[PDB]
Amino acid sequence: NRAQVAARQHNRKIVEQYMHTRGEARLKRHLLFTEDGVGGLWTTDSGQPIAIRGREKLGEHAVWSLQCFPDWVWTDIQIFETQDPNWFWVECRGEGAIVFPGYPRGQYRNHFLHSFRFENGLIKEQREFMNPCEQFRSLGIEVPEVRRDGLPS
Amino acid sequence: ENRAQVAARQHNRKIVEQYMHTRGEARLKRHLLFTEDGVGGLWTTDSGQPIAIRGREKLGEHAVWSLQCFPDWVWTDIQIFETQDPNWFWVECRGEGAIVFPGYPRGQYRNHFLHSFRFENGLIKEQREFMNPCEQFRSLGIEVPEVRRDGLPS
Ligand SMILES: O=C(c1ccc(Cl)cc1)c1c(-c2ccc(O)cc2)sc2cc(O)ccc12
Ligand SMILES: O=C(c1ccc(Cl)cc1)c1c(-c2ccc(O)cc2)sc2cc(O)ccc12
């Protein structure tokens, strides 16, 4: 129990560090992961995650993260510990320029949930969840509209 | 203080369990798990704004529509997360069932969901569910736009 308490307190510090990582520090965020750790975006247009698998690949991906989201900041961070000392959830927002190849530069804002699962004091699995429709908007991509006439309102 | 927090968390967890396992005709009374002014709804939609049902009475009325448009809906793969706030829980799960939206072909809708439950005085003050609307678009036959990935490596 003292060990679970210790694990939770340490893991929480890693979540805080991850969520506050911005700027050039993003180039070393992958060091918060286990060697086989996975991090990525679970909510995309395809319905499949875009997951970066392995600490080395996460470090390589930071280059592309900094290209596509050059000034990204997580804001409004609320960290939730859970009964599992190795599992945390985060509710937050994120904002920054979006610079996707072949799209106009945009300003992207979204609400996010993150899941952090730990192993031996480092992140084993990070997942972020958002509404892709807001990212479509930031890219100038038309968002389909569910017709609401027949729904209660 | 800790005893009161522990008591609140244990009770609130039972309410979350009950909510997540409410199926079929019991859905018509799910609103009784809310405070009178409780709010529940879908936070992730095509508009970017929540579709929130405000007040226990309106939640009960909305259950009628819910049972018509998602007549056999179930939540599955339910994982309930207590938090350091005895009045705040998160749930990761999936949901599935027929989707019968007005003016759209009858479909089968499956999605991954996160739910947030915030409690006041032992009942739900705020329920919010979060999903990827693209999967609901697919269930309705609505074309999902595709972000071009040619310059976007993973
Ligand atoms: O926004 C992201 C994203 C993907 C993964 C991660 Cl880890 C973070 C963001 C998205 C992409 C991406 C892929 C590779 C890359 O190098 C940078 C961005 S394609 C895509 C397609 C969507 O419908 C929504 C989001 C994204
Ligand atoms: O599926 C839902 C939904 C909304 C709120 C709640 Cl509480 C549950 C489901 C959605 C809608 C709705 C509105 C009112 C109603 O009576 C039934 C359905 S429009 C819409 C539009 C979207 O792009 C995605 C989901 C929904």
Numbering used by the authors:
A (entry chain B): 13 to 165
B (entry chain A): 12 to 165
From the paper:
Modifications by the enzymes PhzE,34 PhzD,35 and PhzF36,37 lead to the highly reactive aminoketone intermediate AOCHC (2).38 Two AOCHC molecules then condense to the tricyclic phenazine scaffold HHPDC (3), either spontaneously or catalyzed by the enzyme PhzB, which is a homodimer and belongs to the nuclear transport factor 2/ketosteroid isomerase family. can be further converted into different biologically active phenazines such as pyocyanin (4) by the enzymes PhzG,40,41 PhzS,42 and PhzM,43 respectively. PhzB in its homodimerized form displays binding sites for two substrate molecules (2) in each monomer. The C-terminus of one monomer functions as a lid, shielding the binding site of the neighboring monomer and thereby contributing to substrate binding and stabilization of the complex. To this end, we initially confirmed the target by performing cocrystallization of RAL with a PhzB ortholog from Burkholderia cepacia (BcPhzB). The active site of BcPhzB features the same amino acids as the target enzymes from P. aeruginosa (overall sequence identity: 58–59%, sequence alignment: Figure S1) but crystallizes more readily than the P. aeruginosa proteins.
Subsequently, cocrystal structures of BcPhzB in complex with 10d, 20a, and 20b were obtained. The binding mode of 20a/b differs slightly from their dihydroxy analogue 10d. Although initial results suggested that the cross-monomer binding of Pro164* by the 4′-hydroxy group was an important factor for ligand affinity, the large distance between the donor–acceptor-pair in some monomers (e.g., 10d/i) exceeded the range for hydrogen bonds and suggested a weaker contribution to binding. Potency was further enhanced by modifying the 4-position of the benzoyl moiety with lipophilic substituents such as halogens or a pentoxy moiety, resulting in the most active derivatives of series A, i. e., 10d (IC50 = 1.7 μM) and 13c (IC50 = 2.8 μM). In summary, most compounds of series A and B inhibit pyocyanin production in the low micromolar concentration range with the best compounds exhibiting IC50 values of 1.6 μM (10d) and 0.9 μM (10g), respectively. 10d and 10i show 3- to 10-fold higher affinity to hER-α than their parent compound RAL.
